[PDB]
Design a protein around this ligand. Sequence first.
Ligand SMILES: C[C@@H]1C[C@H](C)CN(c2ccc(C(=O)Nc3ccccc3C(=O)O)cc2Oc2ccccc2)C1
Ligand SMILES: C[C@@H]1C[C@H](C)CN(c2ccc(C(=O)Nc3ccccc3C(=O)O)cc2Oc2ccccc2)C1
Lengths: 320, 320
Amino acid sequence: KNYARISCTSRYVPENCVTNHQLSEMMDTSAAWIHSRTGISERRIVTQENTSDLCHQVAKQLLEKSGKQASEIDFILVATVTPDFNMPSVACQVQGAIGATEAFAFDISAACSGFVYALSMAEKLVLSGRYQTGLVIGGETFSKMLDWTDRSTAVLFGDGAAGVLIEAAETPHFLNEKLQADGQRWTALTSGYTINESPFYQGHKQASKTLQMEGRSIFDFAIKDVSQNILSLVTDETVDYLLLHQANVRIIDKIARKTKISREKFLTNMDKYGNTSAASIPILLDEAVENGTLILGSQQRVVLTGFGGGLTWGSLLLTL
Amino acid sequence: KNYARISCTSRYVPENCVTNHQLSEMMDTSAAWIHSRTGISERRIVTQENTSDLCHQVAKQLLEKSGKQASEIDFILVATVTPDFNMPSVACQVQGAIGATEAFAFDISAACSGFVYALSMAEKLVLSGRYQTGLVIGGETFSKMLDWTDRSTAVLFGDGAAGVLIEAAETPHFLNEKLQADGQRWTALTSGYTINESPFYQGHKQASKTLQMEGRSIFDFAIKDVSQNILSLVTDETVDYLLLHQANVRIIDKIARKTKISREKFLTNMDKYGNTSAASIPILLDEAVENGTLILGSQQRVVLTGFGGGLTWGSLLLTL
Ligand SMILES: C[C@@H]1C[C@H](C)CN(c2ccc(C(=O)Nc3ccccc3C(=O)O)cc2Oc2ccccc2)C1
Ligand SMILES: C[C@@H]1C[C@H](C)CN(c2ccc(C(=O)Nc3ccccc3C(=O)O)cc2Oc2ccccc2)C1
């Protein structure tokens, strides 16, 4: 048994629900326009929780659902770009919160590709035969990284976390993968810059630290490069469902045409969550499993496709 | 060929050299006292470079040394807790800087255990058979995370980066490993907190963001837990050299006694670098290889042991 397998899914978002109506007041825009530009109706925003707290509940819920003991966890991987501290890692805060004393843990930084990247990691870890049980969680609190006056980005993001319980299976589930990156375009999407202000620094680098994005640029990138990445693993005839990063539904609309894969196969759920970055795919996954669209153990050929800052992007082809 | 192997080593530190004499003036302490408390005589501090720049030179040097093409790199892993941005990752900035268009990349957050953790990752990646050539670099610019007035921590850290070229070998090199963590003590060593100041935040969390450490606490932790972790892989009779995280030489003095492993086997090099966090082990490694203490391809049984914020710690047993 050295084949990684997603046994359980689970998600957790802040209770505070922020509708477009509240954002139209905060800012000076119309809820109607916020809705048509984003494809979002409402989103959750933390009021007292930080990334680790959201990830903590996900882990806690995964443990209760599966009936697993925190002591049976061998490793905890968290995909995030909005961690409480640089040190400790969010994965370590969760490891301590749930008491997974026998698990080692760390965070992975790959922007909105983070969950897919982390999932690829867990597969490698389990393949080695050294580890069998892990928790892979994607979580963010981007609401603390936004300029809530600029209505061309703030209205786009939601907070939340979701993950899965991974355990060693007898038969393969993770069939193929293709992880990629292009740092030659890293300026297209950035956040979290830290100014060096030691008495030794001589540069004049300044950066608000709030998210910055070249919409058209990354939109075009997704359509061209993600489409090619997806087509390197499947074709319409060999895939049942595709769970892409929930950045913008129109990206999905166009990718389905580009790749010639049936549009109803691409699941989406931005309406109530907005763009939850690394958490987008596992939140979508938990919902699709929860309502019976996706069925664990059914052998449905599913592709998970993330893409984001880096630039980063990658897909995983699995049989649920 | 699916056995990870360290083929090349390389290091890079800022040219700006800061001696204890300059720090005694800056602060109001004696160089003599800074020396006896830290075991450091001088350290490098960035004046214009950021973590990615240091890691960039390491990658660039590794590529030139080995004669490899940036296009032959399959993956780039960077261990850091002081990245330029949360997004993009430092690994992505390096991937773009050196033109490793065929490599996917991401950063790993495991504090001063980061390099060991990243190395464990690369081993898993190569084991899978999907990837053969990678660059694993540990780099930090902690000088931007310190309060240069508090002489109980600032005098401790240096800037720098170092890494290795990893490629698929025919015979095993990575013999064993034991990665661990304890998030129940994460408050003992923290840095980089990000305050949430969205119009929705109701908490009153505040944190300077500069490094905070409970010296005695983590010192005791290292002596007890790292000693046990090391003894789970070797005994004096089965190890030739041990490269531990360069946090404090006295930790090594005591660990050698605790574990009963010959003291001359633990290599150290804080004098000219200070504590370079994640970069400490690969800098030490490159130096020991450079001067002939350690010999690649000689089959010397070597243990790499990192420990740091998280809490995190772990060792790798290899035959060079
Ligand atoms: C609030 C604004 C409203 C506008 C209409 C859409 N915005 C946009 C929202 C999302 C994207 C986009 O491509 N996003 C992404 C692409 C790759 C990886 C990650 C993302 C991410 O949003 O996290 C791009 C946007 O801007 C354009 C889309 C098409 C053509 C030109 C720009 C969000
Ligand atoms: C500048 C100060 C000078 C004092 C004398 C030593 N400081 C200290 C320097 C380092 C440590 C220490 O244990 N460090 C660590 C332990 C585990 C993982 C990482 C570190 C790290 O420094 O990065 C602890 C220190 O403080 C004590 C050591 C022994 C007993 C009580 C406190 C640094």
